[PDB]
Each structure stands twice: as C-alpha cells, then as structure tokens.
Amino acid sequence: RKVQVLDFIKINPAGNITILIDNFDIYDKNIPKLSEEIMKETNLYAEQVGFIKDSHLQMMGGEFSGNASRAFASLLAFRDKDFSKQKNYNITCSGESKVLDVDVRNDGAKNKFLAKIKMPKFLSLEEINVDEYKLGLVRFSGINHFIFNIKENKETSFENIIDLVKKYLSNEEYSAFGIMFFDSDNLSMKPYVYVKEVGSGVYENSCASGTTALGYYLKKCKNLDRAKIVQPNGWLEYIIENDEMYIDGPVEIIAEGKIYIGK
Amino acid sequence: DRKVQVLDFIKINPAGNITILIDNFDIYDKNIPKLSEEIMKETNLYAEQVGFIKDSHLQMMGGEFSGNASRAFASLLAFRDKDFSKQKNYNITCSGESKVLDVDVRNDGAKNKFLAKIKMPKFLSLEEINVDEYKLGLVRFSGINHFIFNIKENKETSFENIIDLVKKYLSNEEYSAFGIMFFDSDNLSMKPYVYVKEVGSGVYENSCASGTTALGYYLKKCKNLDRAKIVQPNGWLEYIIENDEMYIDGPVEIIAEGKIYIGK
C-alpha cells in the first residue's frame, strides 16, 4: 500500500502535547481519521493535533484550542529570523472568529518559550447545588466547564461526581463538558473532559479553557484577578485585565520531521 | 545558561515496545542516560526505550540487550536500503550481546512495515516452581528471571496475589529485576508483568521478547510446542525454537524520523 509522508512538529504547550501537520490540505476529509492515528501511543504520542497553513491553525475537529494556538505561536517564533526575546504574532484558529494576537517570549533555551493568548468570554456563570454538593458552572460556546472544589465539599470519589454531573446534563444537550477538580491548599486542578464522540472521559495534562473557567470562578467568588494553576503535567496562568481573559504558559518545541502513515 | 542540542531521531514500533534510536551521536557519551530519560517522557517524544546507532551497532541506553530494539534497528537498516525488496538478512550488534546478530527482515505490507526475526539469548535455568497453592515455570536469564504462570492450569487466583507471592520468593535471592508471564492457553495471550527494585513498582508491558522467549522454552518442555504466536497487550510476537536455538519473530513499523531539540 501507499505510505503517506507528512510534515510534523511536536510541541509541549504546558503538557497539552500537540502535533502540528504542515504542508497538508487543512480541509482534507480524512483529517480526523489520520489524526487519531497520529495520536496513539503506537505512533507519535499526542493529546491533540492541528494542521497549519500560513498563519491559520485548523484543529482536527474545527475546535478552538488555546494551548494549540500558543504552540503554533511559539513555533512561528522558533522559525523567525527576527525573533529576539519578545514578539507578538497574529494568528487565526478554527472556532475563534477574531485574529489572535499572541505575545510570545523566550523562556530560557531557544526551543523554550512563554506564550500568552486572549481566551473567549464565558456565556454564563452559575453557582449550582447538586444533591449534597456545591459545584461551579461556567458555560462556554461548545463546552460546559464544572468547578468542583475539593476542600469546600465533603469527601467523595471523583467518579461519583463525574456521574453526578452527567446526571445534571441529562436533560440538557451538549457536545462536551469538563469538571475542574480544584484543590485550594495547592492551587492545583485536575482537568476532566468527556466528549460525545469518544464516549469516555479524559484526564488531561493541562486545560487552557478549563483554567479560564477556574479563573472566572475565582474572580467572582474570591476576587482573584490572576493566578498560576498547577496541573497534572504542566501549569498555566490565567489573567483577567480590563474584563478580558488571557492564559499564559510555557511552551517547548520537542521534535520536527517526517511521519509515515498509511493512505 | 541556555543551549539547545539537536539530535537525529527515529521512532519505531517493534510490537508495541516503542523505541527511539538516535543517529550520528557519540554512543559512549556520559550524558546518554540523562538524554534517554528526558527523551522518554510523555511530555517529550514518547518512548519506552532509547538506543544509539553507530554503523551496524546498537548501543542501548544502559548497555543491555533488547531483542525488540535490535529488531527495530534491523528494520531501519532495511528501511534505508534502496535495494531491499521483500526479504534481506542484516548483520548487526547490540550492547550486552557478545555474538553478532543475523536478523531476517521481510516486508510486512508497506515500506514502513517489516517482520524481523532475531536469535535470542538462551536460558540459564529452566524449572517448575510451586509456590503456596500455585505452580509457575521459572526460566532464568542473565539479567532477569521470568516466572511463567499458566492460568488455565491453575486454580482461581488474582494477578496481584501472584505478584506478591513471587516477590516474596525473590526476597532471599538478589534480583536486579524479575518478570511474570501471565499466560492464557485458550487465546495464546500473555500479559508481561515486570518489576524493578529501583522503580519499586510494576508495569504490564505492551510486549516482552525475552518474556515470550521464556514462555516458549517452558512450552517446549511442558507441551512439546516448538513455535507459537503469542498475542500481547499491544502487539504480538512469535517464538520459533529451531535446532535448539530460540528465535523471535514480530512486526516493526517505522513511525517517524527527523530532529529533536533537548536543552542542555
């Protein structure tokens, strides 16, 4: 059979492992099929994958990803003869209609960077009481984040909550949701993400949109304007300024070259 | 204090035992262990083991033999041989193996897919142990001692129960490592459980060529089974006993290659 050779760049945006495929039809029909192949452990590993063209980033499912957009912005600095310490890069991403002005700065090594990006605004902020648990609820365009504060609630297993949430959205149509298990003693967060297609949960290494939900929620409930939220395999800082949300974090270009898959 | 190191990498999938081979590097660098450690992280290029190439030699990150890695190296040689058609034998060497390794590489469906057969080290001991209520066929080797367990031929048990029982065996025996081949005769399946004193914990590998070898030896005595294809958690390897010599066959796919950037 035919082996298809693609141009790849592997990047670690604060643990949210991203692969970017270059010189590829960003609107190819088979993108979702080869994307899951690119991500398996039996191939190059990845938590997400995108297909770049000029200054656009076409995610595998037309979704917007703050972490992926920051990886793409750090890649343009990596490849820019003129980049010194700081430089703003304008890009576009599927799922966001506005041009994104990403502030990229050097973070030590030439492959290491720090990328800040403007994050979408929330559509609603509710504080909900489900059964005998308090939860935070932040509704975005596409995904609904839930904030479960470990300390502020009684002892329980995560699994009980993932099920309880799933019960809350029983009579509510959604494409995906997220539970941000938040530990106040540490200012840490374990991001959870269910989606309809996968039909199963996924504990991520870091979740940019989830950190904004966390951020919006700590702003309204505790008057916290910006903070650094440590996550399973990385960290992200949320910044609220002039009523605008921004997520900053580290980024690192891992590897670059060719990837051989079937056709 | 900021410096990027640029290495040539090849990512291969020898029956689920993800391998990264580094090319054109000093295979006797002091920093090899630390470089292998960072390259293996999930937050980096992912890998279960790292090798370092020099001509026809493969230098594993610690100086130890790996049948899967060697199979991956040979498959790479075939990948880069413009004259490889459908089958070709390749002569290579591997750290921790005093004898040259003639590897039989064959096409497996495409230019990146290969079937590679390799000769494996012979066992140093073969014996049937009987702990508490269960029996288990120890097949020792220079490095690791594998503990076969036939589940169809044993009473109802828990995997963890056995693991503990075996770990208590090894108390009075100095062991740098040990493994447990959970073998199911009905489906010819095998769950390779491994343990290391340094790690202090176990892992169920996607494949173990040396464990399939141990299984094969015990099956040749306990059944007179000379060869069989053993399905594993994320891959399959076939064992072939021939002229009292152990071979391991299996698939190897070339995943990717290019450059990797590591700070120093």
Author numbering:
A (entry chain A): 3 to 265
B (entry chain C): 2 to 265
Published text:
In this work, we set out to find the physiological substrate of the cofactor-independent racemase (predicted DapF, FN1732) from F. nucleatum ATCC 25586, and were surprised to find that this enzyme functions as a histidine racemase (HisR). Here, we characterize this enzyme as a histidine racemase (HisR), and found that catalytic turnover is ∼10,000× faster with L-histidine than with L,L-lanthionine.
To confirm this, we used site-directed mutagenesis to generate HisR mutants C67S and C209S. Catalytic turnover of these mutants was greatly reduced with D- and L-histidine compared to the WT enzyme, as expected. Mutation of an active site cysteine to serine is a common strategy to aid crystallization of cofactor-independent epimerases and racemases, and likely aids the process because this mutation slows catalysis and helps to keep the enzyme in the open conformation. In each structure, a sulfate (mutant C67S) or a phosphate (mutant C209S) is found in the active site directly between catalytic residues. The substrate binding pocket of HisR has an overall negatively charged surface, and does not contain any basic residues. The position of the loops above the active site spanning from residues 42 to 49 (N-terminal domain) and 197 to 206 (C-terminal domain) in HisR more closely match the conformation of the open C. glutamicum structure than the substrate-bound, closed form. Overlay of the structures of CntK and HisR showed that while these two enzymes have relatively low sequence identity (28%), their structures are overall very similar, especially within the active site. The positions of backbone atoms in DAP and 4-hydroxyproline substrates were highly conserved, and interactions with their respective epimerase enzymes were very similar.
